[PDB]
Amino acid sequence: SDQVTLLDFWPSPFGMRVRLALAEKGVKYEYSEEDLRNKSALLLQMNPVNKQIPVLVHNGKPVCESLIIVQYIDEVWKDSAPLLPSDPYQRAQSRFWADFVDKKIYDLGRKIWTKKGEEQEAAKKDFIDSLKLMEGELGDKPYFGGETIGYVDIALVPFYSWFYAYETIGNFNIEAECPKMIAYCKRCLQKETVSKALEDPQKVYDFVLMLMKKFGIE
Amino acid sequence: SDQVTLLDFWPSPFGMRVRLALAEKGVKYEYSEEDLRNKSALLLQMNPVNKQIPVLVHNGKPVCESLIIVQYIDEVWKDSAPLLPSDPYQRAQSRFWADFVDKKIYDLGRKIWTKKGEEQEAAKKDFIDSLKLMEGELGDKPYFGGETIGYVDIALVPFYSWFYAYETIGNFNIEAECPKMIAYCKRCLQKETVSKALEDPQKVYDFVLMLMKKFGIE
Numbered sequence: 001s002d003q004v005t006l007l008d009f010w011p012s013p014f015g016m017r018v019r020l021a022l023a024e025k026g027v028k029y030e031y032s033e034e035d036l037r038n039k040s041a042l043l044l045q046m047n048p049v050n051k052q053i054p055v056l057v058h059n060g061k062p063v064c065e066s067l068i069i070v071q072y073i074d075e076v077w078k079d080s081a082p083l084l085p086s087d088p089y090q091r092a093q094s095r096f097w098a099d100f101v102d103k104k105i106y107d108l109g110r111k112i113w114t115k116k117g118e119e120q121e122a123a124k125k126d127f128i129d130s131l132k133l134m135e136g137e138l139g140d141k142p143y144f145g146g147e148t149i150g151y152v153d154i155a156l157v158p159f160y161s162w163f164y165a166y167e168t169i170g171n172f173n174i175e176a177e178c179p180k181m182i183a184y185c186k187r188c189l190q191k192e193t194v195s196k197a198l199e200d201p202q203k204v205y206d207f208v209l210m211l212m213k214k215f216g217i218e
Numbered sequence: 219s220d221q222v223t224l225l226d227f228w229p230s231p232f233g234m235r236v237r238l239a240l241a242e243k244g245v246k247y248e249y250s251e252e253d254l255r256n257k258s259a260l261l262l263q264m265n266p267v268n269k270q271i272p273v274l275v276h277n278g279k280p281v282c283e284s285l286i287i288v289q290y291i292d293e294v295w296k297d298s299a300p301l302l303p304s305d306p307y308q309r310a311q312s313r314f315w316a317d318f319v320d321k322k323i324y325d326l327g328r329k330i331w332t333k334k335g336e337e338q339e340a341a342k343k344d345f346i347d348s349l350k351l352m353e354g355e356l357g358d359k360p361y362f363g364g365e366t367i368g369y370v371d372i373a374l375v376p377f378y379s380w381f382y383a384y385e386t387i388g389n390f391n392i393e394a395e396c397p398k399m400i401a402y403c404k405r406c407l408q409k410e411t412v413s414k415a416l417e418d419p420q421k422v423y424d425f426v427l428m429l430m431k432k433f434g435i436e
């Protein structure tokens with residue numbers, strides 16, 4: 001009976017998080033591709049402050065910010081396995097590592113393709129170091145969520161679709177430095193929800209090339 | 219029966235958030251002042267990744283990141299009014315605006331005292347604009363949480379203790395531009411939990427002066 005619309009833009013790893021969370025919890029929804037150059041009345045109505053995607057509109061009410069949206073989904077749709085742990089301590093740990101993806105993985109990945117020379121080299125090193133910290137957190141578990149896809153998996157795994165772009169522009173190989181991280185991503189990709197939610201790495205790379213041309217930083 | 223320790227550093231608005239949340243929910247705890255130049259074994263044990271305060275140690279388990287800690291406190295101690303709304307939509311809105319404090323209020327406030335000239339002027343303008351957006355969200359309610367101190371109040375109000383420093387270094391007057399925000403802060407300060415948790419603005423300013431001397435940016 002519920003009305004669910006996702007305002008999104010295809011190459012966004014932030015949008016991919018929400019696509020994955022909706023799929024993982026079996027939520028039926030309408031996907032709406034936004035033109036971010038000419039933002040729709042709906043996007044402006046629903047996210048007046050940030051004017052960004054993704055935005056989830058559920059029964060006429062908007063939820064903004066990808067990680068906030070994933071938590072909302074977890075709290076609202078309950079007829080599947082939880083994405084966040086029920087134990088408060090474990091839940092706080094999951095929040096810590098999901099945030100870490102925003103603060104380190106996204107930020108440093110962005111520096112890899114937007115910067116050059118020594119600054120870019122530093123970003124690559126810090127990016128790899130950050131993935132290594134996540135490998136440590138994963139430990140011997142198959143997923144960050146344990147035996148199923150959890151909040152941290154949803155936060156992180158969409159960035160795999162950007163790895164080829166980071167590697168090609170930055171000139172490095174993540175599998176060589178972080179084989180456990182890559183094994184983990186490939187394991188996640190065996191799942192239909194993950195493979196359907198994540199975009200093609202070649203297409204994402206071509207999108208980043210378009211941005212580099214736009215900003216004159218090839 | 220529970221063991222609670224807060225690792226903190228007195229002028230930190232992030233630590234003040236946790237001090238306030240613990241007070242608001244009536245949690246007994248031991249406050250531990252950290253020297254961030256010579257970090258203690260305990261801090262290094264409890265926050266190996268970020269090595270930052272605040273850290274809440276509850277029954278031997280660490281919780282890091284101020285907003286994550288406040289949510290943890292809300293989920294664990296239940297014999298007082300909730301800090302976050304029970305309705306998922308309202309809860310997502312509260313998370314949005316608490317995050318906004320980190321992303322705009324803290325960030326822009328920092329630029330006001332660390333930058334000069336035109337860059338500093340831009341930071342002041344954006345800071346005021348951000349407070350105005352929060353005034354709009356407050357609307358006609360006495361607190362962001364409605365009729366009691368909520369998550370967003372805890373996220374925001376500690377920054378009032380830094381306002382005098384921003385105003386003095388940046389040369390502007392927040393009350394003149396944002397009378398509603400200042401009325402709100404003063405209203406919060408009528409509460410014992412808020413007044414006891416927030417530090418003296420003169421002392422905070424003197425701390426910032428120490429930092430400006432340290433970095434040679436007076």
Ligand SMILES: N[C@@H](CCC(=O)N[C@@H](CS)C(=O)NCC(=O)O)C(=O)O
Pocket residue numbers: 009012013014036051052053054064065066067
């Ligand atoms: N912190 C946000 C980031 C969202 C974001 O960066 N969205 C971009 C697209 S990937 C956007 O809509 N940008 C607006 C613009 O470029 O005008 C989240 O997690 O949802």
Ligand SMILES: N[C@@H](CCC(=O)N[C@@H](CS)C(=O)NCC(=O)O)C(=O)O
Pocket residue numbers: 227230231232254269270271272282283284285
């Ligand atoms: N995002 C963190 C920020 C905490 C933070 O910035 N902490 C500072 C003190 S205010 C710290 O411990 N700094 C470590 C250092 O300077 O080495 C939070 O919200 O808790």
